[PDB]
Design an enzyme around this catalytic site. Structure first.
Site, PDB file in Angstrom:
ATOM      1  N   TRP B 275       0.818  -1.214   0.000  1.00 14.68           N
ATOM      2  CA  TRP B 275       0.000   0.000   0.000  1.00 14.68           C
ATOM      3  C   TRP B 275       0.840   1.246   0.000  1.00 14.68           C
ATOM      4  O   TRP B 275       0.312   2.363   0.000  1.00 14.68           O
ATOM      5  CB  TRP B 275      -0.792   0.028   1.240  1.00 14.68           C
ATOM      6  N   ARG B 436      -5.623   2.969  -3.077  1.00 16.22           N
ATOM      7  CA  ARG B 436      -6.848   3.138  -2.293  1.00 16.22           C
ATOM      8  C   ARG B 436      -7.270   4.584  -2.188  1.00 16.22           C
ATOM      9  O   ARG B 436      -6.480   5.444  -1.843  1.00 16.22           O
ATOM     10  CB  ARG B 436      -6.729   2.534  -0.911  1.00 16.22           C
ATOM     11  N   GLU B 546     -16.776  -0.224   6.137  1.00 12.60           N
ATOM     12  CA  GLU B 546     -16.202   0.144   7.432  1.00 12.60           C
ATOM     13  C   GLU B 546     -17.168   0.181   8.632  1.00 12.60           C
ATOM     14  O   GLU B 546     -16.949  -0.515   9.598  1.00 12.60           O
ATOM     15  CB  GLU B 546     -15.486   1.486   7.301  1.00 12.60           C
ATOM     16  N   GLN B 659       8.876  -8.015  13.593  1.00 18.03           N
ATOM     17  CA  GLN B 659       8.715  -9.327  14.269  1.00 18.03           C
ATOM     18  C   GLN B 659       8.525 -10.475  13.304  1.00 18.03           C
ATOM     19  O   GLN B 659       8.989 -11.594  13.604  1.00 18.03           O
ATOM     20  CB  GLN B 659       7.531  -9.381  15.244  1.00 18.03           C
ATOM     21  N   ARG B 740      -9.226   9.080  12.193  1.00 15.77           N
ATOM     22  CA  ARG B 740      -8.863   7.776  11.563  1.00 15.77           C
ATOM     23  C   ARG B 740      -8.534   6.740  12.634  1.00 15.77           C
ATOM     24  O   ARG B 740      -8.172   7.085  13.800  1.00 15.77           O
ATOM     25  CB  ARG B 740      -7.689   7.946  10.576  1.00 15.77           C
ATOM     26  N   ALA B 741      -8.649   5.477  12.248  1.00 17.97           N
ATOM     27  CA  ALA B 741      -8.453   4.369  13.142  1.00 17.97           C
ATOM     28  C   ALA B 741      -7.045   4.267  13.768  1.00 17.97           C
ATOM     29  O   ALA B 741      -6.888   3.933  14.981  1.00 17.97           O
ATOM     30  CB  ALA B 741      -8.840   3.076  12.439  1.00 17.97           C
ATOM     31  N   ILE B 742      -6.013   4.558  12.994  1.00 16.43           N
ATOM     32  CA  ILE B 742      -4.659   4.427  13.520  1.00 16.43           C
ATOM     33  C   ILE B 742      -4.438   5.381  14.714  1.00 16.43           C
ATOM     34  O   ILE B 742      -3.970   4.935  15.770  1.00 16.43           O
ATOM     35  CB  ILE B 742      -3.590   4.524  12.408  1.00 16.43           C
ATOM     36  N   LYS B 802      -0.469  -5.288  28.424  1.00  8.78           N
ATOM     37  CA  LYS B 802       0.296  -4.108  28.036  1.00  8.78           C
ATOM     38  C   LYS B 802      -0.272  -2.863  28.722  1.00  8.78           C
ATOM     39  O   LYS B 802       0.176  -1.734  28.492  1.00  8.78           O
ATOM     40  CB  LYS B 802       0.306  -3.943  26.477  1.00  8.78           C
ATOM     41  N   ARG B 861       9.765  -5.688  28.751  1.00  7.05           N
ATOM     42  CA  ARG B 861       9.713  -4.395  28.077  1.00  7.05           C
ATOM     43  C   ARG B 861       9.220  -3.268  29.003  1.00  7.05           C
ATOM     44  O   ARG B 861       9.635  -2.112  28.836  1.00  7.05           O
ATOM     45  CB  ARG B 861       8.761  -4.444  26.890  1.00  7.05           C
TER      46      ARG B 861
HETATM   47  N1  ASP Z   1       2.901  -9.740  18.573  1.00  3.17           N
HETATM   48  C1  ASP Z   1       2.564 -10.195  19.923  1.00  3.17           C
HETATM   49  C2  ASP Z   1       2.495  -9.007  20.871  1.00  3.17           C
HETATM   50  C3  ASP Z   1       3.819  -8.416  21.124  1.00  3.17           C
HETATM   51  O1  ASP Z   1       4.872  -9.127  21.024  1.00  3.17           O
HETATM   52  O2  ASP Z   1       3.817  -7.216  21.456  1.00  3.17           O
HETATM   53  C4  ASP Z   1       1.216 -10.865  19.958  1.00  3.17           C
HETATM   54  O3  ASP Z   1       0.284 -10.346  19.352  1.00  3.17           O
HETATM   55  O4  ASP Z   1       1.029 -11.903  20.605  1.00  3.17           O
END
Ligand code: ASP
Ligand code: ASP
Lengths: 911, 916
Positions: B275, B436, B546, B659, B740-742, B802, B861
């Site tokens: 995108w 888009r 949406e 990741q 917006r969603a973000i 978190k 973290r």
């Molecule tokens: N990606 C991980 C979350 C993370 O590592 O922050 C999960 O959704 O399980």
């Protein structure tokens, strides 16, 4: 080479060659060494013959081609009596080898680090909770404080009751050899080349020594001594190792004290020389003898470790012990001069030693002479006398600043003393209700007051309560006595005379009534027994189980009995017995319900109830499965006190290897503790209803095959070695021979029969039931465990063996009956698979599956050998062309005995 | 020393110190080295300050003593601007370090040997099925023949669509540094001579520093072109090689189930799309020129990657034995300024003669794109260049055949087969670009046309009238747009986009997504604009519905499209529809969006079947399927029956790309689970919900949406609260409906509060349980037994791990006016009650007790994230309130606020990763 045998074995059990999975390798190594031994002892040809039986048998188990079974048959019928014994001996010994290997594998198999927490985890040794993990679930998941957990364990009681091996108590000498084979195998995978070469040669030598310990039947006294061997081998040391781990687990949940040395957490008991039910060889003399033997052995075990404690207890530093030492101040291994008084703990323990010696010697003279002049003050007559001076040493070390030393060997010894007492095992007596009736009927007739036997239940009760407070004794010298009545009265004589710490319960077989229990109480009062044994009814048939509630209610309503019982009652259930009457499914469900109902009745009357679990339950499997089996019990059926049968055929698996011994003791304790605070879910009402409906059908199918088919008995006597095992019909046959005869055929009818109709009918009545059953399997511990045991039994099944026995031994007009039982087996198995969610038998327990699978070729060879041997025994006009002798006044009955023992050793527990 | 920091870290994450569990050690080692670096670069005092923030922050996370948060506050508000930047930089970098270590841990964590077979196994990397195990379950448990499995995989399509990092695309240079840190760390635990350790130690040290000092923050945010190039970096780093490694494993798995052929090199199993420079929704900086540019960049990079490996293939392909077909071709070429083969190739080296030509062509293809890009045009002709992927395959297929025909099959299946697969997967453009734009822009464009033509106002027209006019013009005989059409800048920008589609090759593009789609006419509108520009190969048109109401109107809209002859004929048996979890959850709350999305997909699947149309559901951001890792695997298998049907198309969200693809093993396993799950789902659907469950889910949706909407839209002061409690406004650098969603998810993630993820679940559960006590048990059964429900709860449980209502409370004390604080307080009570309900439904005491490795990762973290939160909170007070004053410490560093905030925001986002 060895590589070749390894490859051979892997064709039956393939796939995931991981690093702690060495079982196939172990088996290869043992088999390799044993084949050499056979060559040396009996010649290459015989080795090749054994190899060929193995191969044929492996191929038959691989692909199930019945041509292969027939070939093995041809080979085996052709062997002369002498060759035939060697082959039977060889394959039995291979089984014992595969079992030692498997124990080693279970001992060292890796635990799963992360557990899912589903109750299914507790079915499997690799995932089950240990004692610490149980503590932590109780604290964190059930909100118990660590103190509450600690307090429950302190008050908890686990009692393991050892019963005779139904076929063959392994003798002390051989069991030790089995141990050394296993150890040498362990040590081989630890290693310098010369050590390996030496261990290799030591393994070879022990395999041979075992094989050549291969020498009519044994006295119950000797059977008792053989059954006690596991104490020396593992349990004696294992109890303190496990109690010490409790200490560590307590410490790791914040409890800052050791588990008290005299908490009666573990008790062992025995039926060996105590159970005379249907067994007139177990006489009063036998009972007296095994009590003295137990006393002799226990003192001897203490005596033979006290010198080690004395060496270690060199310390010179409290006035209480100082004083005792001064007061006190030859033919032994260590301290044969007088001990000096600057060695105070040794002066005390020196006296304990002498006393132990005298206690051991009295029992020996009592046993071989008939009496001893040795007096009570020279000897320990009660366990407190032995503890007392040991507690003194413990306190003296603590007061002098040596707490830490006290909690070593001295604490171990204190625990052994508290657990084993003066008699390693307390002995249960068991006898059937009708024998008591007979004894009382003799008394009533002789007294001229009528016939107890003719009397109603109400009259029996009324007369028993009046005589339980009678002012005259019942038995005059002139009472005439059949041999059976005498044997029963003289049993009570023996109870009156031996110390009460010899005994546990008086179990009444075939109990049905309030009066059955009162009968035994009256005989104990008549003998003036200072401490009457508690009276425990064993209700066996479905109808008896159904009448038990009203019977306990009445007992608990009687002032005399409540007063006698002092807030406590034990009741015994026998899964195998109830299953003989009604089929295993219906016995399981009924037993679940009955236990609920008797728990409720106990509560109502403020009586603490112990359920004593006789043989044949899920709880008697051993290993991981025993752990979930225990946690499946109905709510409040344990309540801090477990009493279970350790079946003779499982003793070796449970206690032969030190790690397995430890883990057996651990799961019994962990499971008991947890259940009282974390009951399994209770069944949904739809489940009960369906289980009731399925019981009616399962019982109808089982009973219609086993009792109403007029030719069933006749089929049984031909298809099965039942009759030869001797060395009315089914109702009259005892449970052990029933399970055993069908286990010898690889058919196991007594375990699965009835489950087929139960399932078929449930699923046909309403398609939705399949899913209900599957949910029951995933969610209901009782159901899961019930289905699992049967699934394990089918993994040991092989309908081809049953078919072969039919061809050789059953007349043509009965063969289709046999064939139809085989179709029932197949259909029953498939229904069970569908309910369990499995394509293959035991896909939920692949390590168990592998273990059972490695055994099959050996078992199969023995089955084939047995089948033709029975043909020859049964028909002196059956003959075939024998091969000229292959090996380098012993008969067909001897070969059959070897065969029966071998099969039983590979089949282990079933129903 | 190092033992001391290790001990400190273990207080937060204690228990089962096993042998493959090295995460704590990795983190201790990295932190130790980075503290030395900070001493060297900025002085002991600054090191002590960083250490003390870390310690205070660790203790606070351990025991949650609020005195400890207050101390960290005091320390952090006292720092001058300069010290404050160094601290924020330090803690962000620590986070990046802990993420690298965690990746290493996931890479090497040991698999469980024996799997229970429950679907829960597929939530976890250590228990999930690999491709072979998926094959074997399908053969042995679902009775598929190996051939059937093979055939399904051959026809299968998995398409991953990469989106921008919402907060900070990591630049190519830094990402490589992160890679080397990770590798040095890896090698330190390999073997190890003392000097190797000393040398690796020094190398590790040096890379941590290099990464830390790549720290220009610049005035101009980055060009979309540059954002696109940064987002492409992972191809070079892992995916380029990873695709063939994974396809080779497919070969091996196929062999192990009895299939004796390799997976065909040109089965389009894996496709990547993008995108970046294609999405202009609510974003006028993504111009037609930008789109043209990223297409040419994608083309340039791809040819460049092929070009720069072709020389290695040429060296290896020394063989002299060729078949006469290749012999002949070689002879032709031998008649008619590089690193390696710079003299004429001799003809006794036939494979090199062929590949020599392929090289030259690749070079020319790469150069045309470069000139097109920097000049405006190139004189380089079509025949000097590859214009279609088959032209590049052709000579490589020839080499493959020639080796086979000469007896060297086995050699063919090495590098040459890898290259064939790379060519087949990446084509001439690494990623196909999606365009888009929102529906209303198309309306605006058509309304301009209709007014200018004097036939009225498209905008004013009804849906039926729109459709009627669109279908007449879709078969029209003249064009719509005359030279004199007057054009607002927005209308022009949208028209010129189609110009760019008309001109670039069709292999540059994938879909035209319509944001805010509601109608049949929205889709036809785009189709009319494409026909008007005469695009030889029109992009497929994909509506993104949406709002809940839009999702509810989607079925009738698709029914109508599928009923129209013109459209059916155009669509040729295939349609894609897009769903956006985050978007729908903004409208209606995440619970009710989750359930509605489940239902809507069922209903559109059914409609597609009825009309004989193959349906692709394209998964936008915010779903369970976007989590990455193990959880993605069960997420996919949870899909409603037949919603995949051989063709997966999912968003890989920018905040998860690192990741999923930064480390080679994780890359491999991401590709594997997307392929394994897709194959399996088509043959092994999850159970369908029991009717009681649907009924309850419907009842719960009504209540969740009422609670969520009453807080978010009807509370008159909600927006005002949001602008004070949250850094939303500063992130800029109608009300919520229009946001917006973000930025919605982000703003609450920065506060550790996550309202958008859980709000509404509380009321849903409470109401269910209070209506009937027996619902608790139903909900628990749903959790144990219904994949969709399990996976929905798990994502929310991960979000709560978190969360920290203390950080939210602190932001209230500092930034919210008194009269709004109790509103904040009551949302926190809702958070507690919601969390507790979720726990009770999951059968858990503690958050994530079902996933202790995830819990450990998130927990390591927190100290870093918390330090940044506290720093951010007081920074926002200072930026917002110049009557807030503090005694600043004398400068600590050796050798304003907006800059600190930027670092803060990016660091918190990096540690929070994916949530809603
Ligand atoms: N990606 C991980 C979350 C993370 O590592 O922050 C999960 O959704 O399980
Ligand atoms: N004791 C095992 C069976 C066996 O090993 O024979 C079980 O019950 O699972």
């Amino acid at each position: 080479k060895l590589a070749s045998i390894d490859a051979q074995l892997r064709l039956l059990v393939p796939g995931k060659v991981s690093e702690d999975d060495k079982l196939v390798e172990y088996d290869a190594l043992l088999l390799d060494k044993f084949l050499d031994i056979l060559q040396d002892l009996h010649g290459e040809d015989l080795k090749e013959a054994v190899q060929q039986c193995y191969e044929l048998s492996a191929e038959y188990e691989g692909k199930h081609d019945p041509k292969k079974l027939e070939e093995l048959g041809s080979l085996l019928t052709s062997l002369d009596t002498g060759d035939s014994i060697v082959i039977a001996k060889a394959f039995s010994h291979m089984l014992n080898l595969a079992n030692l290997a498997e124990e080693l594998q279970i001992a060292y198999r890796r635990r799963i680090k992360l557990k899912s927490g589903d109750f299914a985890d507790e079915a499997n040794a690799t995932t089950e909770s240990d004692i610490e993990e149980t503590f932590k679930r109780l604290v964190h998941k059930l909100n118990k404080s660590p103190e509450e957990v600690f307090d429950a364990l302190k008050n908890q009681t686990v009692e393991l009751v050892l019963t005779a091996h139904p076929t063959q108590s392994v003798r002390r000498s051989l069991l030790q050899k089995h141990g050394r084979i296993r150890n040498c195998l362990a040590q081989l995978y630890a290693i310098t080349p010369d050590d390996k070469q030496e261990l290799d040669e030591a393994l070879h030598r022990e395999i041979q020594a075992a094989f050549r310990t291969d020498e009519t039947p044994p006295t119950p006294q000797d059977e008792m001594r053989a059954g006690m061997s596991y104490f020396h081998e593992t349990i004696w040391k294992g109890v303190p190792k496990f109690l010490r781990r409790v200490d560590t687990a307590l410490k790791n949940i914040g409890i800052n004290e050791r588990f008290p040395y005299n908490a009666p957490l573990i008790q062992f008991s025995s039926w060996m020389g105590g159970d005379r039910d249907g067994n007139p060889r177990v006489t009063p003399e036998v009972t007296r003898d095994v009590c003295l033997l137990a006393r002799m052995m226990t003192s001897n075990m203490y005596f033979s470790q006290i010198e080690d404690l004395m060496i270690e207890m060199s310390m010179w530093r409290n006035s209480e012990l100082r004083v005792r030492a001064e007061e006190l101040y030859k033919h032994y291994i260590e301290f044969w001069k007088r001990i000096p008084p600057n060695q105070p703990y040794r002066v005390i323990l020196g006296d304990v030693r002498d006393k132990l010696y005298n206690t051991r010697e009295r029992s020996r003279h009592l046993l071989v002479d008939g009496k001893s002049d040795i007096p009570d003050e020279a000897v320990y007559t009660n366990v407190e006398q032995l503890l007392e001076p040991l507690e003194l040493c413990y306190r003296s070390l603590c007061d002098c600043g040596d707490h830490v030393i006290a909690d070593g060997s001295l604490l171990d010894f204190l625990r052994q003393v508290s657990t084993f007492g003066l008699s390693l095992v307390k002995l249960d007596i068991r006898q059937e209700s009708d024998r008591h009736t007979e004894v009382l009927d003799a008394i009533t007739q002789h007294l001229g007051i009528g016939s107890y036997r003719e009397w109603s239940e109400e009259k029996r009760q009324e007369w028993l309560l009046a005589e339980l407070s009678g002012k005259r004794p019942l038995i005059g010298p002139d009472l005439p006595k059949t041999e059976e009545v005498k044997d029963c009265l003289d049993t009570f004589k023996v109870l009156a005379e031996l110390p009460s710490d010899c005994f546990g319960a008086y179990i009444i077989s075939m109990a049905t009534s309030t009066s059955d229990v009162l009968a035994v109480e009256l005989l104990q009062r008549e003998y003036h027994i200072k401490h009457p044994l508690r009276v425990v009814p064993l209700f066996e048939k479905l109808a008896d189980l159904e009448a038990a509630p009203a019977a306990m209610t009445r007992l608990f309503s009687m002032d005399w009995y409540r007063n006698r019982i002092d807030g406590k009652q034990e009741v015994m259930i026998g899964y195998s017995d109830s299953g003989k009457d009604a089929g295993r499914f219906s016995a399981a469900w009924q037993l679940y319900k009955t236990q609920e109902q008797i728990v409720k009745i106990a509560k109502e009357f403020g009586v603490k109830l112990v359920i004593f679990h006789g043989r044949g339950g899920t709880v008697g499997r051993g290993g991981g499965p025993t752990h979930l089996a225990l946690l499946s019990q109905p709510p409040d059926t344990i309540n801090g006190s477990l009493r279970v049968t350790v079946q003779g055929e499982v003793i070796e698996q449970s206690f032969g290897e030190e790690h397995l011994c430890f883990r057996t003791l651990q799961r019994f304790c962990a499971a008991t503790l947890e259940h009282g605070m974390n009951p399994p879910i209770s069944p949904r009402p739809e489940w009960r209803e369906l289980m009731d409906q399925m019981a009616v059908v399962a019982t109808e199918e089982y009973r219609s095959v086993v009792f109403k088919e007029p030719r069933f008995v006749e089929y049984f006597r031909l298809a099965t070695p039942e009759l030869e095992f001797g060395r009315g019909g089914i109702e009259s046959l005892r449970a052990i021979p029933w399970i055993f005869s069908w286990t010898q055929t690889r058919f196991h009818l007594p375990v699965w029969l009835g489950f087929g109709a139960a399932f078929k009918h449930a699923i046909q009545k309403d398609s939705k039931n399949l899913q209900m059953l599957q949910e029951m399997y995933k969610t209901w511990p009782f159901f899961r465990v019930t289905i699992d045991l049967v699934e394990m039994v089918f993994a040991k099944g092989n309908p081809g063996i049953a078919a072969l026995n039919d061809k050789l031994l059953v007349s043509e007009d009965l063969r289709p009956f046999g064939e139809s039982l085989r179709a029932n087996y197949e259909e029953t198995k498939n229904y069970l698979l569908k309910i369990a969610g499995h394509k293959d038998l035991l896909e939920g327990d692949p390590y168990l599956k592998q273990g059972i699978r490695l055994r099959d070729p050996y078992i199969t060879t023995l089955n084939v050998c047995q089948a033709y041997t029975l043909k020859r025994i049964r028909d002196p006009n059956y003959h075939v062309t024998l091969r000229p002798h292959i090996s380098k006044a012993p008969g067909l009955e001897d070969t059959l005995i070897l065969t029966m023992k071998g099969i039983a050793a590979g089949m282990q527990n079933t129903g």
